Amino acid sequence: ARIAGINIPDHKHAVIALTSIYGVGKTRSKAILAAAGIAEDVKISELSEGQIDTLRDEVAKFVVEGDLRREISMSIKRLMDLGCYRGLRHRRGLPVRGQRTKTNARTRKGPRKP
Amino acid sequence: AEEQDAAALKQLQQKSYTPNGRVVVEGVGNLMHHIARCCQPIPGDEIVGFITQGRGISVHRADCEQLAELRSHAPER
Amino acid sequence: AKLHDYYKDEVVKKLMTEFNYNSVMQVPRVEKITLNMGVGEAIADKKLLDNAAADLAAISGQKPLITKARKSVAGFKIRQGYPIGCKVTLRGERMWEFFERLITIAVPRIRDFRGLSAKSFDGRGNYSMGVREQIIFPEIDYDKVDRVRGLDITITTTAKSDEEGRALLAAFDFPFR
Amino acid sequence: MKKDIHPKYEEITASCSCGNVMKIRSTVGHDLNLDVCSKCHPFFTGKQRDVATGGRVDRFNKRFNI
Amino acid sequence: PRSLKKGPFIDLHLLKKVEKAVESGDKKPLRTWSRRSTIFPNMIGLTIAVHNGRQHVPVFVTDEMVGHKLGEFAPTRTYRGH
RNA sequence: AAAAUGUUCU
RNA sequence: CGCGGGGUUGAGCAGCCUGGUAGCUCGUCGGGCUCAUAACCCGAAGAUCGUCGGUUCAAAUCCGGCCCCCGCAACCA
RNA sequence: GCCCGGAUAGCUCAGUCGGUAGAGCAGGGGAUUGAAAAUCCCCGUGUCCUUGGUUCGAUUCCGAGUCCGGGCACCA
RNA sequence: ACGACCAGGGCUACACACGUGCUACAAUGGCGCAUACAAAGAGAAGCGACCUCGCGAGAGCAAGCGGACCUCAUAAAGUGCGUCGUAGUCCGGAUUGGAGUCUGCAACUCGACUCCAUGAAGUCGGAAUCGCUAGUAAUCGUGGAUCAGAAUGCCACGGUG
RNA sequence: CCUCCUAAAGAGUAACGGAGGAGCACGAAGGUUGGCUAAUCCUGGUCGGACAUCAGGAGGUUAGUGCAAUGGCAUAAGCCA
Ligand SMILES: [Mg+2]
Ligand SMILES: [Mg+2]
Ligand SMILES: [Mg+2]
Ligand SMILES: [Mg+2]
Ligand SMILES: [Mg+2]
Ligand SMILES: [Mg+2]
Ligand SMILES: [Mg+2]
Ligand SMILES: [Mg+2]
Ligand SMILES: [Mg+2]
Ligand SMILES: [Mg+2]
Ligand SMILES: [Mg+2]
Ligand SMILES: [Zn+2]
Ligand SMILES: [Zn+2]
């Protein structure tokens, strides 16, 4: 049960199972399923090889898994290089998107030390 | 011993102490700048500013080694 | 076996064409592929080590030599003569098969793969790589694995220069970067 | 090789999705159904595509068009 | 951010100044206050001294800085540490 | 059972 | 400079006690209780174990030297 | 080899003449108090020290030894 | 000049500590489709049906209504089927990358909302501590004010209970 | 009691001379037969780091010897079976 690199859960329903792939969430999974011609309810158990192949192909059509990671990462790197406000934020480990830092930055800040 | 003591005192004093027209880069004043520590110009025999990515401009003193290197690498900054 | 067959007739010929060697013995040949799983953290438990060994065996159909510590170090908390790794020296038909598997089947299975490192040849012609996740070999069953394990593959060859070795590798497909 | 205590090493039939039937000696036991091989996996096209991405001016132009 | 129908914003004065600079090709960093302005392709190569409230931080305009606003490369707050 | 204290001048 | 003992988290003590596990009380810091500080309650951080060599797989631990301390004996004419 | 005291739950200790796990304390939770003590409930965790053997298996009962305490006696 | 005008910046900073909220940790739940039942409000530089385009935020045309008429505006919990079967999960939505939409001279600092992707912590919370006696708490939504835009806040409204 | 030096190139050789060790250990760490060759260094390579394990080259006994030191030890007296 491999698709676009990584393994997919054998028991889980396709819509959800697909979501395991980095670069597909729910909507994209659904789209993929539609493209294939498969229902959402079916599992990877009771799913044919030919059927799988089509799905895989569909997935390939999107920028997914390692490629996506490479892209996003690259963007971040570029930003950092630029030294744009966003870049600066990224470098510091502070909220990029314009949040308060006085309090509640703990995701990007990390778990508080003192 | 006395001399040593005096020296110590002086050091202490120094420590205690420690505790924008300036550089008009190219006919436009009030540009974010700073003196570089490689060689620090005051009334020096001309200066040159490297337009950095962050922290604005770094003034180098004209005929510096670092500045020369920078020029060699890329003259447009 | 297939790979070996290919080599004798094609790869060697290619090498001859490109480098202009005097003899057919002068062409680089892969001498041994030496797999290594230096488990290390098996100091806590030997079951882990055993598992690793098993995995290695599965990957490459020999049974590994459990290499012990040569000298003691307290940084990793090991003694001399502690089972602290396992190796599989492959040679001949089996080795060839393994190589084929790696190049034709297993390297394609590498996660986030954009080719190998060409700048990794030791100086004296011999290549080495290392797989992050040992699942990439289809010999391992994903349901059975308990540890995110890995190994290093090591293609030793008769090549004098690194360049020659690289060429040889290329002749056996090998994507590089 | 020392008999008995090695694993079994049969010439199985690996068969990927893109019609490359591949007979190899392994210790899986069962016949193998692969995704990708050397004659399909993108280390030629993928590389090309990844490279062709970066650009800002072009994007700007597209956005605006004059 | 700004709508695609509305067209990417640039301060008029800066646009004019930039044009002049490009026309001449004379270098010499442009004093700018309008930080709210998308950098253009024509702005690449120039140095623009973007205000940060206090001073005009000189940004050398790279090819990668285009769709960004000027103020992005001109940090207003000067924080180091606590 | 155990519960101390409240800076000065207004 | 002869004999022993010691130097460890800010303080005091354990550990050393026969190398590989840094603990106890007070203090500190952040909460809480209170009107507020105490006391009390909860959570947390803290240590190249005098220093320098050495032995070692590795030292706080064993050994040497040096630095400071505390005992001590320094006598018979 | 003279005698006699002590080896279990995390720690300190009781105990069946062949079929099982029990106290006070520590630890978890709760009840209680305005708060904290002292309560008081409740669960909890143990190859009964290891290994042969009698036998239906057996902390239980036999064969097999270290460590500390006190006394007495040997020792070229 | 401690007066006045302007541009930009700041009031949104961030080792950190406290307060008040929201969202959670899930199965009394989520997700999917079908379907029922509110009240109260607001609205002409406004509210903006229907129709078309847009996956969607929204865009285009554009009636109606100073409004028991028209609009905001399909209430949501609920109910009926299906699915997931106790997982850091189809829980959770932080975060961040990309693409966008709207407002407004202007969304970089620094708006909201959308889409796709990403999918932190968190598995009911130490000491301590607050609210509430009935249509109350709890929970579910809906409106308003200010407001170009921008509420988990505030002020109201009903549902379940 | 052992090792070095002192000790004057046989032995021996004193000092409250200068240095360190022993009061054992091992039924394999002994016997033998067969085999193997080190420390370190470079480049490379899953987590893996200055330091585990694996490739090869340099290195050539710098190591090892159950423990002190000295003298020995590749024919190895070192390390495997
Ligand atoms: Mg995903
Ligand atoms: Mg202003
Ligand atoms: Mg404020
Ligand atoms: Mg309104
Ligand atoms: Mg969800
Ligand atoms: Mg977690
Ligand atoms: Mg009342
Ligand atoms: Mg509003
Ligand atoms: Mg002599
Ligand atoms: Mg003589
Ligand atoms: Mg290395
Ligand atoms: Zn200089
Ligand atoms: Zn294939």
Side-chain angles (χ1 to χ4, degrees), chain A residues 8 21 45 63 76 79-80 82 85 94 102 107:
Chain A
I8 288 183
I21 297 153
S45 298
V63 178
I76 286 163
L79 283 165
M80 295 256 205
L82 294 220
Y85 181 71
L94 290 161
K102 182 186 249 204
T107 305

Side-chain angles (χ1 to χ4, degrees), chain C residues 55-84:
Chain C
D55 199 293
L56 246 186
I59 284 162
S60 66
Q62 291 183 204
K63 137 211 76 220
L65 187 80
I66 299 169
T67 57
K68 291 148 213 71
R70 190 187 54 73
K71 61 169 190 170
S72 192
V73 295
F76 318 130
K77 306 155 186 171
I78 75 179
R79 206 82 84 263
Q80 180 175 350
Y82 269 34
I84 205 72

